[PDB]
Swiss-Prot record, chain B:
Trans-zeatin binds at residues 136, 158, 168. Induction: Rapidly induced by dehydration. Down-regulated by Pi starvation and induced by cytokinins. Changing residue 152 to I: In wol-1; locked in the phosphoprotein phosphatase active form, retardation of the primary root growth with reduced cell number and exclusive xylem differentiation within the vascular tissue associated with abnormal vascular asymmetric cell divisions, impaired metaxylem and phloem differentiation, and reduced cytokinin-binding ability leading to impaired kinase activity and cytokinin-mediated activation. It comes from the Eukaryota. Dihydrozeatin binds at residues 136, 158, 168. The keyword Iron does not apply. One of its GO terms (biological process) is cellular response to sucrose stimulus. Disruption phenotype: Reduced sensitivity to cytokinin (mostly in shoots). Narrow vascular cylinder composed mainly of protoxylem cell files, with no apparent metaxylem or phloem. Hypersensitivity to ABA. Strong drought and salinity tolerance only in the presence of CK. Reduced cytokinin repression of several Pi starvation-responsive genes and increased sucrose sensitivity. More rapid germination, reduced requirement for light, and decreased far-red light sensitivity. Reduced sensitivity to N-isobutyl decanamide. Impaired benzyladenine (6-BA)-mediated repression of the iron uptake pathway. Keywords: Cytokinin signaling pathway, Developmental protein, Endoplasmic reticulum, Hydrolase, Kinase, Membrane, Phosphoprotein, Protein phosphatase, Transferase, Transmembrane, Transmembrane helix. Residues 49-262 form the CHASE domain. Mostly expressed in roots, specifically in the vascular cylinder and pericycle, and, to a lower extent, in leaves and flowers. Present in seedlings. This is Histidine kinase 4.
Length: 262, 267
């Protein structure tokens, strides 16, 4: 009887600690990605001529990789509307490519080609981030809301690891104060994004912890309560505990669930 | 009764430990973002040809990112200038290196650390030799010799006279060897990225928003020297409960310094 009580208390403690650790690391990453969005705005748009380039972005992001613990890499995609495509591709000496096959993009109203990338995600360069549905939806919500947004869990490029993408908007100085959504769209310069590689880096975070073999941990995206999506853990459908997670995007909801094996 | 007294201590422990965690975490976040600024100056001012950082750019970026550094009133970048170079440096900048105590032209020194970039919140630092204050000077030396973020003892900051501490990071030239000796670090020093932890104002602001703040008295001490504890935050001597206290752990990240928090009831 006393033993059941102690067992419950240990589960709550273990689960709550893991949830705090994960929320905190996510939070630190989001904050540092916000700083990068501000850096691109200040150095690429506010300065004339631009005082940021791929070499500099690669260096800075490499040297600050420690500031973004759950992220496999960061990249900056620029907003390009179709009338500007020819000039853009001539300036960059490359063609805007599709994410799925790396083929030259068919005509679209607009694109979000990656122009700067951390070398860890170098394969993103020139890819149109609107040619992937999760990234596209993220890009639109980022620019319309003015804030960091997260995707549902999905399998990331190259590694195929299950993760979530974080996108921040970057705006031109023409953005009015207290802007409408329409004003936000018009003033959009691009999108600073990062991949939370949950499958690998959350596993590295949690798997090293004492007691890991005694409990089963899942993280769910419960944005749609009738359709919970696994973000971390196995696909399995008594004694559990739900620990709170808040990853900072009001559009999404998450939770951690822990159980004992036996 | 004896039940209520046990619970009274339990609440003090919880309140004090939570406040200590908050202080430690917020300082850690600030230190990490100062580290990123040091890397920014290295990458964008030194490595990039030409430099992308002038005073206007530094002021803008630091203002827009001030939320990243919650326990800091301002940040600035001081460049290492040896005396051989002083006249050249002053001619290029069209200003003279000044002392921090009176803003007067600096006397001849072997070297200087004049502020060349500043967040507007600490704009009065521009052109001041940060080696002309003892706390800042010792911090600069330990920063460059160790390669890590360092903290001063508590002292009254320039202009505000608020009781605080200074955080200083070294910035090195690309000539810094792998696995450098201290002598190599000194030779490769470019300058120093510093930030003012205005403990008196900003820790009061942090604590005063918390529920139960009126019930508790919070002090923070620098206990680097056991026999000479130094007040970092708090009063005396205040109307405080002498019968019960709690000590909460604090670690601000510099192994050269030690700190602790003590809470008591107002009662
Ligand atoms: C700009 C907008 O969104 C991004 C990051 N998206 C992203 N990064 C890394 N791997 C990915 N795989 C799919 N989408 C990915 C950069
Ligand atoms: C470079 C080296 O150290 C600094 C920060 N020092 C500092 N900042 C703001 N107020 C001060 N008052 C004394 N020292 C101060 C900048």
């Amino acid at each position: 009887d006393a033993n059941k009580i102690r067992r419950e208390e240990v589960l709550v403690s273990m689960c709550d600690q893991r949830a705090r650790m994960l929320q905190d690391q996510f939070s630190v990453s989001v904050n540092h990605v916000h700083a990068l969005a501000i850096l691109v705005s200040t150095f690429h748009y506010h300065k004339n001529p631009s005082a940021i380039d791929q070499e500099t972005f690669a260096e800075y992001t490499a040297r600050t990789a420690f500031e973004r613990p759950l992220l496999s890499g960061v990249a900056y995609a620029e907003k390009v509307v179709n009338f500007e495509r020819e000039m853009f591709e001539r300036q960059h000496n490359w063609v805007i490519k599709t994410m799925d096959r790396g083929e030259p993009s068919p005509v679209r109203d607009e694109y979000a080609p990656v122009i700067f990338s951390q070398d860890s995600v170098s394969y993103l360069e020139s890819l149109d981030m609107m040619s992937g549905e999760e990234d596209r939806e993220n890009i639109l919500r980022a620019r319309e809301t003015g804030k960091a947004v997260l995707t549902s869990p999905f399998r990331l490029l190259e590694t195929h690891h299950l993760g979530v993408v974080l996108t921040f908007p970057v705006y031109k100085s023409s953005l009015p104060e207290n802007p409408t959504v329409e004003e936000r769209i018009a003033a959009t310069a691009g999108y600073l994004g990062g991949a939370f590689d949950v499958e690998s880096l959350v596993e590295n975070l949690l798997g090293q912890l004492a007691g890991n073999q005694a409990i089963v941990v899942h993280v769910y995206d419960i944005t749609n309560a009738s359709d919970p999506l696994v973000m971390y853990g196995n696909q399995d459908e008594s004694l559990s505990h739900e620990s709170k997670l808040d990853f900072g995007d009001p559009f999404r909801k998450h939770k951690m669930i822990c159980r004992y094996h036996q």
